[PDB]
């Protein structure tokens, strides 16, 4: 029942590799659907060509600001920012996919991929998926970040879609 | 206030109940004559937002005036929020959330977060920013009463 989405990740235009994600539509269907649809481009906008603008190596890789490319932007499929669906799922280790947000009940399109256990984010950020294939790629991506998040190269979603 | 101990170490120091009594007094002797403002500045050097609230919370009666002051604080806290939109995403290790207006005014922030913002390099001087808002409210009261 849970959909799978892929990102083909590139580093300054050059192919790094593929990350796939299981999306937990059986627990967080609205949040899963948002990410899924932004990944296929079916609404006429979404993640293709966007970047991971904030990478903090021992914490997480953040992306999905496909409108401003710097964390100030984002847009859901719902025409408005949407509610924290639930906080059932926990931030249990590397590969957890979770909503970035800008406060309670402000989910747009930004998300992050955990590169460590971040248990203290529990109840603040909605977990809605986890990396299925390509953890090695996420582990390579974390090399391009810094304390504070600025990336040393442009890390982009060169292609994306639903498997 | 933030202060130093005898071994050269940074410590928060609770507000001297002697500075507090001087202040409360001032506001009750002078009512709200223009001289309360310099007094407040004098008495609140180095104050955290927690210390500032302790000051204000002690003012006995003058309910109408204190309410004018609270309205001013609230308007300034809203303006601060309007001008300082939050960046999306989880707070990184060894960083703090950027203060909201209510953080600056002490209501949703701890002493220890206050001190973190104040003593950070570069700092966010939450005590000085809150003090400015309070002095604008004091100005409003003084314009009303004298």
Author numbering:
A (entry chain B): 2 to 164
B (entry chain A): 401 to 546
From the paper:
Certain monkeys have modified their TRIM5 genes by swapping the virus binding B30.2 domain with a cyclophilin A domain inserted into the TRIM5 locus by retrotransposition. This leads to expression of a TRIMCyp protein with antiviral activity against viruses, such as HIV-1, that recruit cyclophilins. Here we characterise the molecular details of Cyclophilin-Capsid interactions focusing on TRIMCyp proteins from Macaca Fascicularis. Using a structure/function approach we can show the molecular details of how adaptive changes in the TRIMCyp sequence switch specificity between members of different primate lentiviral lineages.
In order to understand the structural basis for these restriction specificities we solved the crystal structure of the Mafa TRIMCyp2 Cyp domain in complex with the HIV-1 capsid N terminal domain (NTD). There are two amino acid differences between the Cyp domain of Mafa TRIMCyp and the genomic CypA sequence, R69H and E143K. Mafa TRIMCyp thus maintains binding to HIV-1 despite the R69H mutation because it conserves the closed loop conformation observed in wild type CypA. The closed-loop conformation allows interactions with capsid position CA88, enabling several hydrogen bond interactions to be made, including between the CA88 peptide nitrogen and the peptide oxygen from G72 in Cyp and a water-mediated interaction between the peptide oxygen of CA88 and Cyp residue H54. The E143K mutation is located in a helix outside of the active site at the opposite end of the Cyp domain to R69H. The Mafa complexed structure shows that the change from a negatively charged glutamate to a positively charged lysine at 143 causes a knock on effect through the molecule which impacts on the stereochemistry of the active site. Mutation to lysine at position 143 causes changes to the backbone of a neighbouring active-site loop around P58 by attracting the peptide oxygen and flipping it from its orientation in the wild-type CypA structure. This propagates changes to other Cyp active-site residues, including R148 that is coordinated by the P58 peptide oxygen in the wild-type structure. The altered position of P58 releases the side chain of R148, allowing it to interact with capsid residues downstream of residue A88. The E143K mutation also modifies the surface electrostatics leading to a significant increase in the positive charge of the active site.
